PDB file of C-alpha atoms and ligand atoms in Angstrom:
ATOM      1  CA  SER G   1      16.109  82.635 -33.386  1.00  0.00           C
ATOM      2  CA  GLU G   2      17.866  79.413 -34.394  1.00  0.00           C
ATOM      3  CA  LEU G   3      15.404  76.522 -34.563  1.00  0.00           C
ATOM      4  CA  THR G   4      16.104  73.624 -36.943  1.00  0.00           C
ATOM      5  CA  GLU G   5      13.715  72.337 -39.617  1.00  0.00           C
ATOM      6  CA  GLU G   6      12.107  69.739 -37.344  1.00  0.00           C
ATOM      7  CA  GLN G   7      12.009  72.128 -34.400  1.00  0.00           C
ATOM      8  CA  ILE G   8      10.438  74.920 -36.449  1.00  0.00           C
ATOM      9  CA  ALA G   9       7.729  72.630 -37.794  1.00  0.00           C
ATOM     10  CA  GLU G  10       7.331  71.281 -34.256  1.00  0.00           C
ATOM     11  CA  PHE G  11       6.246  74.458 -32.454  1.00  0.00           C
ATOM     12  CA  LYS G  12       4.788  75.874 -35.667  1.00  0.00           C
ATOM     13  CA  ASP G  13       2.386  72.940 -35.744  1.00  0.00           C
ATOM     14  CA  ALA G  14       1.483  73.371 -32.082  1.00  0.00           C
ATOM     15  CA  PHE G  15       1.135  77.060 -32.944  1.00  0.00           C
ATOM     16  CA  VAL G  16      -1.566  76.696 -35.583  1.00  0.00           C
ATOM     17  CA  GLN G  17      -3.267  74.259 -33.216  1.00  0.00           C
ATOM     18  CA  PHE G  18      -4.393  77.208 -31.087  1.00  0.00           C
ATOM     19  CA  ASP G  19      -5.484  79.463 -33.954  1.00  0.00           C
ATOM     20  CA  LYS G  20      -9.205  78.955 -34.545  1.00  0.00           C
ATOM     21  CA  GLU G  21      -9.678  82.643 -35.333  1.00  0.00           C
ATOM     22  CA  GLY G  22      -7.588  82.073 -38.449  1.00  0.00           C
ATOM     23  CA  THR G  23      -5.608  85.199 -37.589  1.00  0.00           C
ATOM     24  CA  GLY G  24      -2.384  83.198 -37.593  1.00  0.00           C
ATOM     25  CA  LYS G  25      -1.964  84.407 -34.024  1.00  0.00           C
ATOM     26  CA  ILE G  26      -2.227  82.787 -30.588  1.00  0.00           C
ATOM     27  CA  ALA G  27      -3.666  84.505 -27.514  1.00  0.00           C
ATOM     28  CA  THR G  28      -0.950  85.405 -25.006  1.00  0.00           C
ATOM     29  CA  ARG G  29      -3.209  83.736 -22.446  1.00  0.00           C
ATOM     30  CA  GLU G  30      -2.722  80.425 -24.244  1.00  0.00           C
ATOM     31  CA  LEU G  31       1.054  80.848 -24.295  1.00  0.00           C
ATOM     32  CA  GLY G  32       1.572  78.925 -21.066  1.00  0.00           C
ATOM     33  CA  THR G  33      -0.740  76.196 -22.329  1.00  0.00           C
ATOM     34  CA  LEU G  34       1.272  75.967 -25.538  1.00  0.00           C
ATOM     35  CA  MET G  35       4.507  75.552 -23.575  1.00  0.00           C
ATOM     36  CA  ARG G  36       3.001  72.588 -21.753  1.00  0.00           C
ATOM     37  CA  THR G  37       2.032  71.214 -25.150  1.00  0.00           C
ATOM     38  CA  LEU G  38       5.697  71.519 -26.115  1.00  0.00           C
ATOM     39  CA  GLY G  39       8.814  69.989 -24.587  1.00  0.00           C
ATOM     40  CA  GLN G  40       9.360  73.446 -23.082  1.00  0.00           C
ATOM     41  CA  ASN G  41       8.718  74.304 -19.432  1.00  0.00           C
ATOM     42  CA  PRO G  42       9.185  78.020 -18.549  1.00  0.00           C
ATOM     43  CA  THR G  43       9.150  79.102 -14.907  1.00  0.00           C
ATOM     44  CA  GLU G  44       5.933  80.571 -13.481  1.00  0.00           C
ATOM     45  CA  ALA G  45       7.421  84.068 -13.234  1.00  0.00           C
ATOM     46  CA  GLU G  46       8.744  83.844 -16.803  1.00  0.00           C
ATOM     47  CA  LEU G  47       5.289  83.187 -18.251  1.00  0.00           C
ATOM     48  CA  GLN G  48       3.873  86.028 -16.156  1.00  0.00           C
ATOM     49  CA  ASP G  49       6.590  88.305 -17.550  1.00  0.00           C
ATOM     50  CA  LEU G  50       6.210  87.574 -21.272  1.00  0.00           C
ATOM     51  CA  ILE G  51       2.413  87.320 -21.044  1.00  0.00           C
ATOM     52  CA  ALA G  52       1.949  90.584 -19.141  1.00  0.00           C
ATOM     53  CA  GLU G  53       4.296  92.297 -21.591  1.00  0.00           C
ATOM     54  CA  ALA G  54       2.547  90.969 -24.692  1.00  0.00           C
ATOM     55  CA  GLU G  55      -0.721  91.886 -22.972  1.00  0.00           C
ATOM     56  CA  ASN G  56       0.081  95.593 -23.318  1.00  0.00           C
ATOM     57  CA  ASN G  57       2.399  95.278 -26.319  1.00  0.00           C
ATOM     58  CA  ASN G  58       0.300  93.022 -28.545  1.00  0.00           C
ATOM     59  CA  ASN G  59      -3.233  93.818 -27.368  1.00  0.00           C
ATOM     60  CA  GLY G  60      -4.315  90.239 -26.712  1.00  0.00           C
ATOM     61  CA  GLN G  61      -2.875  88.187 -29.558  1.00  0.00           C
ATOM     62  CA  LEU G  62       0.625  86.839 -30.173  1.00  0.00           C
ATOM     63  CA  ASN G  63       2.531  86.229 -33.422  1.00  0.00           C
ATOM     64  CA  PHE G  64       4.548  83.284 -34.687  1.00  0.00           C
ATOM     65  CA  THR G  65       7.576  85.550 -34.423  1.00  0.00           C
ATOM     66  CA  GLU G  66       6.663  86.493 -30.867  1.00  0.00           C
ATOM     67  CA  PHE G  67       6.327  82.898 -29.672  1.00  0.00           C
ATOM     68  CA  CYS G  68       9.316  81.692 -31.697  1.00  0.00           C
ATOM     69  CA  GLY G  69      11.368  84.602 -30.427  1.00  0.00           C
ATOM     70  CA  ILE G  70      10.987  83.357 -26.865  1.00  0.00           C
ATOM     71  CA  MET G  71      11.346  79.695 -27.777  1.00  0.00           C
ATOM     72  CA  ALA G  72      14.675  80.779 -29.199  1.00  0.00           C
ATOM     73  CA  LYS G  73      15.920  82.404 -25.982  1.00  0.00           C
ATOM     74  CA  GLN G  74      14.623  79.339 -24.133  1.00  0.00           C
ATOM     75  CA  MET G  75      16.230  76.803 -26.461  1.00  0.00           C
ATOM     76  CA  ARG G  76      19.540  78.530 -25.695  1.00  0.00           C
ATOM     77  CA  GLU G  77      19.671  76.092 -22.766  1.00  0.00           C
ATOM     78  CA  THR G  78      21.528  73.878 -25.245  1.00  0.00           C
ATOM     79  CA  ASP G  79      25.070  74.996 -26.132  1.00  0.00           C
ATOM     80  CA  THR G  80      25.384  72.437 -28.944  1.00  0.00           C
ATOM     81  CA  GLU G  81      28.113  73.346 -31.456  1.00  0.00           C
ATOM     82  CA  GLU G  82      25.844  72.319 -34.349  1.00  0.00           C
ATOM     83  CA  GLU G  83      23.183  74.993 -33.860  1.00  0.00           C
ATOM     84  CA  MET G  84      26.079  77.441 -33.603  1.00  0.00           C
ATOM     85  CA  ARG G  85      27.511  76.800 -37.051  1.00  0.00           C
ATOM     86  CA  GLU G  86      24.044  77.331 -38.505  1.00  0.00           C
ATOM     87  CA  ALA G  87      23.795  80.614 -36.605  1.00  0.00           C
ATOM     88  CA  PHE G  88      27.261  81.528 -37.888  1.00  0.00           C
ATOM     89  CA  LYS G  89      26.095  81.492 -41.503  1.00  0.00           C
ATOM     90  CA  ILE G  90      22.960  83.466 -40.641  1.00  0.00           C
ATOM     91  CA  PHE G  91      24.817  86.101 -38.612  1.00  0.00           C
ATOM     92  CA  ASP G  92      27.786  86.535 -40.955  1.00  0.00           C
ATOM     93  CA  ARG G  93      26.236  88.953 -43.453  1.00  0.00           C
ATOM     94  CA  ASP G  94      29.077  88.087 -45.833  1.00  0.00           C
ATOM     95  CA  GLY G  95      30.390  84.742 -47.037  1.00  0.00           C
ATOM     96  CA  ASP G  96      34.010  85.570 -46.238  1.00  0.00           C
ATOM     97  CA  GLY G  97      33.772  83.612 -42.994  1.00  0.00           C
ATOM     98  CA  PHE G  98      34.067  86.398 -40.421  1.00  0.00           C
ATOM     99  CA  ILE G  99      31.759  88.819 -38.605  1.00  0.00           C
ATOM    100  CA  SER G 100      32.404  92.526 -38.023  1.00  0.00           C
ATOM    101  CA  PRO G 101      30.863  94.987 -35.496  1.00  0.00           C
ATOM    102  CA  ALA G 102      28.755  96.301 -38.377  1.00  0.00           C
ATOM    103  CA  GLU G 103      27.425  92.853 -39.232  1.00  0.00           C
ATOM    104  CA  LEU G 104      26.821  92.223 -35.531  1.00  0.00           C
ATOM    105  CA  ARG G 105      24.334  95.048 -34.967  1.00  0.00           C
ATOM    106  CA  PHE G 106      22.821  94.449 -38.395  1.00  0.00           C
ATOM    107  CA  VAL G 107      21.802  90.954 -37.283  1.00  0.00           C
ATOM    108  CA  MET G 108      20.925  91.729 -33.656  1.00  0.00           C
ATOM    109  CA  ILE G 109      18.425  94.260 -35.014  1.00  0.00           C
ATOM    110  CA  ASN G 110      17.059  91.717 -37.494  1.00  0.00           C
ATOM    111  CA  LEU G 111      16.326  89.163 -34.773  1.00  0.00           C
ATOM    112  CA  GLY G 112      14.716  91.720 -32.484  1.00  0.00           C
ATOM    113  CA  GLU G 113      17.480  92.516 -30.005  1.00  0.00           C
ATOM    114  CA  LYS G 114      17.877  96.296 -29.813  1.00  0.00           C
ATOM    115  CA  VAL G 115      21.556  97.024 -29.168  1.00  0.00           C
ATOM    116  CA  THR G 116      24.006  99.892 -29.608  1.00  0.00           C
ATOM    117  CA  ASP G 117      27.357  99.769 -31.407  1.00  0.00           C
ATOM    118  CA  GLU G 118      28.957 100.315 -27.994  1.00  0.00           C
ATOM    119  CA  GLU G 119      27.495  97.378 -26.057  1.00  0.00           C
ATOM    120  CA  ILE G 120      27.946  95.031 -29.019  1.00  0.00           C
ATOM    121  CA  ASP G 121      31.525  96.196 -29.593  1.00  0.00           C
ATOM    122  CA  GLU G 122      32.455  95.080 -26.082  1.00  0.00           C
ATOM    123  CA  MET G 123      30.723  91.732 -26.606  1.00  0.00           C
ATOM    124  CA  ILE G 124      33.047  91.169 -29.563  1.00  0.00           C
ATOM    125  CA  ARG G 125      36.176  91.915 -27.544  1.00  0.00           C
ATOM    126  CA  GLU G 126      34.993  89.358 -24.984  1.00  0.00           C
ATOM    127  CA  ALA G 127      34.873  86.557 -27.560  1.00  0.00           C
ATOM    128  CA  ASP G 128      37.789  87.999 -29.527  1.00  0.00           C
ATOM    129  CA  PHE G 129      41.102  86.872 -28.039  1.00  0.00           C
ATOM    130  CA  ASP G 130      43.298  87.150 -31.142  1.00  0.00           C
ATOM    131  CA  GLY G 131      42.458  90.849 -31.193  1.00  0.00           C
ATOM    132  CA  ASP G 132      41.601  91.711 -34.793  1.00  0.00           C
ATOM    133  CA  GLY G 133      38.098  93.155 -34.602  1.00  0.00           C
ATOM    134  CA  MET G 134      36.632  90.138 -36.384  1.00  0.00           C
ATOM    135  CA  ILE G 135      34.900  86.915 -35.337  1.00  0.00           C
ATOM    136  CA  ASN G 136      35.514  83.347 -36.461  1.00  0.00           C
ATOM    137  CA  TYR G 137      33.226  80.301 -36.154  1.00  0.00           C
ATOM    138  CA  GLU G 138      35.047  79.717 -32.844  1.00  0.00           C
ATOM    139  CA  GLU G 139      34.708  83.134 -31.193  1.00  0.00           C
ATOM    140  CA  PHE G 140      31.125  83.227 -32.469  1.00  0.00           C
ATOM    141  CA  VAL G 141      30.079  79.866 -31.014  1.00  0.00           C
ATOM    142  CA  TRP G 142      31.306  80.967 -27.591  1.00  0.00           C
ATOM    143  CA  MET G 143      29.584  84.371 -27.378  1.00  0.00           C
ATOM    144  CA  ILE G 144      26.320  82.914 -28.699  1.00  0.00           C
ATOM    145  CA  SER G 145      26.528  79.988 -26.285  1.00  0.00           C
ATOM    146  CA  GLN G 146      26.082  82.399 -23.398  1.00  0.00           C
ATOM    147  CA  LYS G 147      23.362  84.348 -25.217  1.00  0.00           C
TER     148      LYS G 147
HETATM  149 CA1   CA U   1      -5.746  83.714 -33.551  1.00  0.00          CA
HETATM  150 CA1   CA U   2      31.347  88.964 -42.976  1.00  0.00          CA
HETATM  151 CA1   CA U   3      38.968  87.587 -33.619  1.00  0.00          CA
END
């Protein structure tokens, strides 16, 4: 995910709003209702996809990480360069200023995106034009913009 401070507290607030059980979780059936409560607006099919999935993958309750996770993929609708730089620091395991195939999978797995060293390697080559096997704030911004 890559939500700012205000954004995080925004959906996080609307998240606790639908948690009377005190389980820090929100019913997947209330997901669509929560979206309406938020500036979001997922397509009918979309809601039916994530809800049905979480219905047999999370019993009947959803987690902050679950909701946020989606909100993240949804927020991607904005290719703002700002949110990219922030994601650059988070992704880049090191402070050198570059990302390597190793660091790529390491992060993708942290977020929740299951990927192999093969598929991710190609993704790097796509954003890597200088051909060096490393990513810079520029090559990163581009590949994540399409994410
Ligand atoms: Ca709950
Ligand atoms: Ca690094
Ligand atoms: Ca490069």
